[PDB]
Scaffold this active site. Structure first.
Site, PDB file in Angstrom:
ATOM      1  N   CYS A  46       0.860  -1.124   0.221  1.00 49.71           N
ATOM      2  CA  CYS A  46       0.051   0.137   0.137  1.00 49.71           C
ATOM      3  C   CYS A  46       1.035   1.135   0.092  1.00 49.71           C
ATOM      4  O   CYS A  46       2.139   1.049   0.299  1.00 49.71           O
ATOM      5  CB  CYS A  46      -0.760   0.251   1.604  1.00 49.71           C
ATOM      6  SG  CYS A  46      -1.983   1.324   1.345  1.00 49.71           S
ATOM      7  N   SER A  48       0.547   3.924   2.336  1.00 47.15           N
ATOM      8  CA  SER A  48       1.125   3.654   2.903  1.00 47.15           C
ATOM      9  C   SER A  48       2.086   3.289   4.162  1.00 47.15           C
ATOM     10  O   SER A  48       3.348   3.937   4.736  1.00 47.15           O
ATOM     11  CB  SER A  48       0.013   3.968   4.304  1.00 47.15           C
ATOM     12  OG  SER A  48      -1.361   4.895   3.767  1.00 47.15           O
ATOM     13  N   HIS A  51       4.880   5.433   2.583  1.00 43.34           N
ATOM     14  CA  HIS A  51       4.753   6.880   3.736  1.00 43.34           C
ATOM     15  C   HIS A  51       6.059   6.378   4.555  1.00 43.34           C
ATOM     16  O   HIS A  51       7.202   7.542   4.858  1.00 43.34           O
ATOM     17  CB  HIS A  51       3.981   7.248   3.418  1.00 43.34           C
ATOM     18  CG  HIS A  51       2.726   7.699   2.813  1.00 43.34           C
ATOM     19  ND1 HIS A  51       1.420   7.618   2.661  1.00 43.34           N
ATOM     20  CD2 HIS A  51       3.716   8.461   1.273  1.00 43.34           C
ATOM     21  CE1 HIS A  51       1.295   8.017   1.734  1.00 43.34           C
ATOM     22  NE2 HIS A  51       2.006   8.496   0.870  1.00 43.34           N
ATOM     23  N   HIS A  67       0.466  -3.411   6.313  1.00 45.25           N
ATOM     24  CA  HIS A  67      -0.888  -3.375   7.410  1.00 45.25           C
ATOM     25  C   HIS A  67      -2.107  -3.968   6.674  1.00 45.25           C
ATOM     26  O   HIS A  67      -2.768  -3.865   7.191  1.00 45.25           O
ATOM     27  CB  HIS A  67      -0.402  -1.964   8.106  1.00 45.25           C
ATOM     28  CG  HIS A  67      -1.078  -1.068   6.637  1.00 45.25           C
ATOM     29  ND1 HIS A  67      -0.171  -0.383   5.444  1.00 45.25           N
ATOM     30  CD2 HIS A  67      -2.673  -1.100   6.046  1.00 45.25           C
ATOM     31  CE1 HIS A  67      -0.459  -0.233   4.777  1.00 45.25           C
ATOM     32  NE2 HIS A  67      -2.235   0.101   5.165  1.00 45.25           N
ATOM     33  N   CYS A 174      -7.344  -3.021   3.492  1.00 45.24           N
ATOM     34  CA  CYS A 174      -7.286  -1.699   3.292  1.00 45.24           C
ATOM     35  C   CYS A 174      -7.999  -1.432   2.565  1.00 45.24           C
ATOM     36  O   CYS A 174      -9.276  -0.686   3.166  1.00 45.24           O
ATOM     37  CB  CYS A 174      -5.922  -1.608   3.474  1.00 45.24           C
ATOM     38  SG  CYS A 174      -5.833   0.648   3.876  1.00 45.24           S
TER      39      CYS A 174
HETATM   40 ZN   LIG Z   1      -3.266   0.538   3.433  1.00 41.16          ZN
END
Ligand SMILES: [Zn+2]
Ligand SMILES: Nc1ncnc2c1ncn2[C@@H]1O[C@H](COP(=O)(O)OP(=O)(O)OC[C@H]2O[C@@H](O)[C@H](O)[C@@H]2O)[C@@H](O)[C@H]1O
Ligand SMILES: Nc1ncnc2c1ncn2[C@@H]1O[C@H](COP(=O)(O)OP(=O)(O)OC[C@H]2O[C@@H](O)[C@H](O)[C@@H]2O)[C@@H](O)[C@H]1O
Ligand SMILES: [Zn+2]
Ligand SMILES: [Zn+2]
Ligand SMILES: [Zn+2]
Lengths: 374, 374
Positions: A46, A48, A51, A67, A174
């Site tokens: 993902c 995220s 990041h 995650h 997610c």
């Molecule tokens: Zn995510």
């Protein structure tokens, strides 16, 4: 076999910001009370997670990230009741403790035990279960799915149907739920309505599918990359618009095309300017605009509050507005009952040891979603 | 007596921006089809009327302003059915045509026949019914209540209970409904909730009363003027806070006092900074912030979209979210049944010819509401 003992396995460890992930041998301590140890079957890459690499999403390092996953319960600590060894599970980056004022609220889902607001990189009891060569390694969002095995708090794990295919349903952890819930739970898209979706990556596709499940009549996909349109239409977009084709601003094109503005707009790019354009293109009197993601280093946006005064509603949410532990198992039931299709979202499948290649694919825009398999 | 004839009466005419109102003898043409002529009994002085004076709210001049009134029907044009001569009425600055896609929508109330968006200063048929010395005078928001007599479209007038006291219920035409509806219809304040109201002028008091009718447990009034607190508490504020008393920012004080943020916040000052503070002080996961007014010359505000992403909802509305022709008569029924009290809102009553004195009282902050009587 391995219950109550330390397990040595491989994990992808991020030692410092802006460096590649190192595959390392790590020790995964046994679960203490209300903790579950899980064998990972598949995990999504993902934004995220990127990041974290870039230092945008601040979290203590070194860390095992990831995650969005699914796996199989290996063992349970003292006083775990919701799951048993061998059960298929999805770890939840948004917990559902059941106790706090958010979990008690009919509308809220951002549980006060989350590790997203002030990140500690720990389990709920304040320690780590990972070591690499005697050195403690932080968790990420109480999940850490970039490891063959992980330990998660019971409030952060959902039991799913025994017959589920884990290589697909990890997306429920997610990207898919975020997009789909934004339409079905946060916006409450109604039958017959007109929707516009800004951004046709994985989460925008998921929003489109949500709009379609809710019975939207028209779903307008907007994206500056024309290659995204083919899949957007396959999952339900009735029309696609490329803002670079026009001489006028996109909200004026969208307001002309929908005869005075769309019922629901969804911003899924993460860009400031497009958040405001998305609000503007919804109908002035009763339009709803939903912000689906925000990059964690975003500046302020600039917006005229007159956009709100006629009757528009602006909202955001995490995890599609879904109460995580309640919803995930029902989303998986809906997949099993064939109500939606996750395969158009999955463009690349890589073995876990090619994690750094997975991230390149994500960084370059070739992938809708890459899944890593263990 | 005067049906089907021109009527000569007095009006307050605004000839140019930034000048006082001139009391003038004007001619009021008879109502054409679907128009109603009304004898004004009482009219409120609102901020919006001052914005016309200042050139902030752009509308063609010369104009008869005023939009918050009550009166008595003098005569009806061809094909009017909803009202009869002698009926008590409230003119509606937000029409309810019943036909357009907003009026058909369960949530919308900003009727597409409004004269607020692109103002023409005319009746719905595109002409005026006012002259002063042979010169045409524009209408304002299809109401123009600063005249002993006015003509309004049938879609812009609501019939109210025959026994109503007009000197009080004229407030239902703007200020009271705007505030009260913001709480009862736009926010949907729930029983037991915590509310914060920024600004304790007339509309903030009305929001407080709405919060109280909806059963809020705690209602926190916020205002930089301590003299406003006494009335705020009389209508239902449980606490009042003055931001000048604190060393820290008000949203941090409000977040401490409500144990993690209020359920509903309402911005009723019209200031950019306080809009953003109001959003921030609501609970991150499920908080609702409502913007009650916006000055019509407002710049852009500056806001971090991360405020929305946890689960907050930001919304605005006109006229309290109420469908005007449906709601006004039921609000007046509730007043008649003693469910709320308009008298704390009324601080000064002046005869119509002292209109310029009324505006001074408004400009200086001495008044909650001034009512002009004919
Ligand atoms: Zn995510
Ligand atoms: N100005 C623009 N206008 C329209 N589309 C744009 C623009 N700029 C970029 N895009 C498009 O936005 C899309 C971004 O998609 P991805 O980068 O694959 O992202 P995805 O995994 O779907 O999520 C991106 C992130 O943004 C958040 O809103 C979302 O929740 C997620 O965290 C791409 O299709 C890209 O072409
Ligand atoms: N920074 C501040 N913080 C808190 N209160 C403030 C601040 N600045 C001014 N105020 C207060 O705001 C209030 C403004 O009240 P009025 O001027 O009487 O306005 P009212 O008729 O209630 O409406 C004002 C206008 O703003 C809109 O949001 C509203 O719909 C209306 O159009 C006053 O009580 C004033 O003390
Ligand atoms: Zn909780
Ligand atoms: Zn209408
Ligand atoms: Zn008004």
């Amino acid at each position: 076999s391995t219950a109550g003992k330390v397990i040595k396995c491989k994990a992808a460890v991020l030692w410092e910001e802006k460096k590649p992930f190192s595959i390392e041998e790590v020790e995964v301590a046994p679960p203490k009370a209300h903790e579950v140890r899980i064998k990972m079957v598949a995990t999504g890459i993902c934004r995220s997670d990127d990041h974290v690499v870039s230092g945008t999403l601040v979290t203590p390092l070194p860390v095992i990230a990831g995650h969005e996953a699914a796996g199989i319960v290996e063992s349970i600590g003292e006083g775990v009741t919701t799951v048993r060894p061998g059960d298929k599970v999805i770890p939840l980056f948004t917990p559902q403790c059941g106790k706090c004022r958010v979990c008690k609220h009919p509308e809220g889902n951002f549980c006060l035990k989350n590790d997203l607001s002030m990140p500690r990189g720990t389990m709920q009891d304040g320690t780590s279960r990972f070591t690499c060569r005697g050195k403690p390694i932080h968790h990420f969002l109480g999940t850490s799915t970039f490891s063959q095995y992980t330990v998660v708090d019971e409030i952060s794990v959902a039991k799913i149907d025994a017959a589920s295919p884990l290589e697909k349903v990890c997306l429920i952890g997610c990207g898919f739920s975020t997009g789909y819930g934004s339409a079905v739970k946060v916006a409450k898209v109604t039958q017959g309505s007109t929707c516009a979706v800004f951004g046709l990556g994985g989460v925008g596709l998921s929003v489109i599918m949500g709009c379609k499940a809710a019975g939207a009549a028209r779903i307008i996909g907007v994206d500056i990359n024309k290659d995204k349109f083919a899949k957007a239409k396959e999952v339900g977009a009735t029309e696609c618009v490329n803002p670079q084709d026009y001489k006028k601003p996109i909200q004026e094109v969208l307001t002309e095309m929908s005869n005075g503005g769309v019922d629901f707009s969804f911003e899924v790019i993460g860009r400031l300017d497009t958040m405001v354009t998305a609000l503007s293109c919804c109908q002035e009197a009763y339009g709803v605009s939903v912000i689906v993601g925000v990059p964690p280093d975003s500046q302020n946006l600039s917006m005229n509050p007159m956009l709100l005064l006629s009757g528009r509603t602006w909202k955001g949410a995490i995890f599609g507005g879904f109460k995580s532990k309640d919803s995930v198992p029902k989303l998986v039931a809906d997949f099993m009952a064939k109500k939606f299709a996750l395969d158009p979202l999955i463009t690349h499948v890589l073995p876990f040891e090619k994690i750094n290649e997975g991230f390149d694919l994500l960084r370059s825009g070739e992938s809708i979603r890459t899944i890593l398999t263990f």
